[PDB]
Amino acid sequence: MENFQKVEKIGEGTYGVVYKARNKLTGEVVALKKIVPSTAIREISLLKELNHPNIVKLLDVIHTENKLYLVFEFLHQDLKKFMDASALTGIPLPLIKSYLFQLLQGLAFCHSHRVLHRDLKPQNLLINTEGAIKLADFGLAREVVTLWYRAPEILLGCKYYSTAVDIWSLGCIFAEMVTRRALFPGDSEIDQLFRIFRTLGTPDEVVWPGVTSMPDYKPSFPKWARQDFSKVVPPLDEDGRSLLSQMLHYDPNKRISAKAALAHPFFQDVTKPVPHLRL
Numbered sequence: 074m075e076n077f078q079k080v081e082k083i084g085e086g087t088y089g090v091v092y093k094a095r096n097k098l099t100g101e102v103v104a105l106k107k108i109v110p111s112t113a114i115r116e117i118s119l120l121k122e123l124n125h126p127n128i129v130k131l132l133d134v135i136h137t138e139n140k141l142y143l144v145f146e147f148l149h150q151d152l153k154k155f156m157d158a159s160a161l162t163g164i165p166l167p168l169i170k171s172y173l174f175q176l177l178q179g180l181a182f183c184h185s186h187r188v189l190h191r192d193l194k195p196q197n198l199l200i201n202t203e204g205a206i207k208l209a210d211f212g213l214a215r216e217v218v219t220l221w222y223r224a225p226e227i228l229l230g231c232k233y234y235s236t237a238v239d240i241w242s243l244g245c246i247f248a249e250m251v252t253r254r255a256l257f258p259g260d261s262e263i264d265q266l267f268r269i270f271r272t273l274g275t276p277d278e279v280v281w282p283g284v285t286s287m288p289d290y291k292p293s294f295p296k297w298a299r300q301d302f303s304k305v306v307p308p309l310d311e312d313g314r315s316l317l318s319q320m321l322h323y324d325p326n327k328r329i330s331a332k333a334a335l336a337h338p339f340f341q342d343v344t345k346p347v348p349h350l351r352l
């Protein structure tokens with residue numbers, strides 16, 4: 074740790090403080106996360122090999138004094154801050170599409186390696202001046218924590234959920250980019266679940282076979298009717314709404330995969346614009 078000079082706290086991750094820092098040696102500017110069980114060390118060690126242009130690079134893993142420090146590549150801005158900055162006119166559709174496309178590429182990569190993120194949220198989607206967007210904290214899961222992006226199968230007590238939970242989260246973020254308001258801003262697990270039911274309809278055996286057997290499912294759940302996506306994410310076009318609908322499928326087995334999503338017609342005209350970043 075004496076090999077780094079802390080420049081500033083750049084947030085408070087779900088595992089500890091995150092600092093912009095400088096390598097007192099090479100002068101390199103990095104993101105330093107302060108998080109030990111052997112399982113943790115081995116698993117994290119695998120993460121150092123999971124390299125892709127849309128995944129924030131894990132430079133080094135420092136274990137000292139029973140302390141765990143993760144050294145990452147540094148990115149100047151996160152998607153929450155950017156959405157807040159583009160709140161007046163909204164993020165241009167071509168840039169939303171680009172970002173969604175890139176994130177789907179990062180997801181497809183991780184998923185092909187059986188690595189899940191599990192906690193995707195605007196705060197951990199990082200952007201740079203070149204129009205790149207990257208996933209931060211991938212594989213780590215394996216201040217109130219936000220439930221807004223949590224998949225229904227997790228909320229219903231599914232113990233062995235899979236890659237589909239990340240597609241759900243990314244669907245919620247896509248919607249938020251488009252409308253400029255959180256899709257399902259729950260402030261408790263039941264509030265989150267009910268916000269989802271009120272919009273997508275209370276799930277049942279017809280749309281989600283086996284849902285009624287889920288650990289936390291209750292027959293006493295109110296039965297709300299599903300809303301039209303046209304009302305949910307105006308003025309997203311038909312391609313966008315169609316893709317969104319597939320990313321928000323209740324059944325995790327019906328939920329579109331990242332790889333399939335990349336082939337959706339929505340991306341037919343994808344480009345890579347440059348955002349205006351005021352650092």
Ligand SMILES: Brc1cnn2c(NCc3cccnc3)cc(-c3ccccc3)nc12
Binds near residue numbers: 093145147151199
């Ligand atoms: Br790895 C990592 C590399 N950059 N980075 C950033 N940079 C964005 C930024 C830069 C400068 C000032 N404020 C924000 C934020 C978070 C993060 C992730 C989760 C929660 C909080 C922060 N993790 C990282």
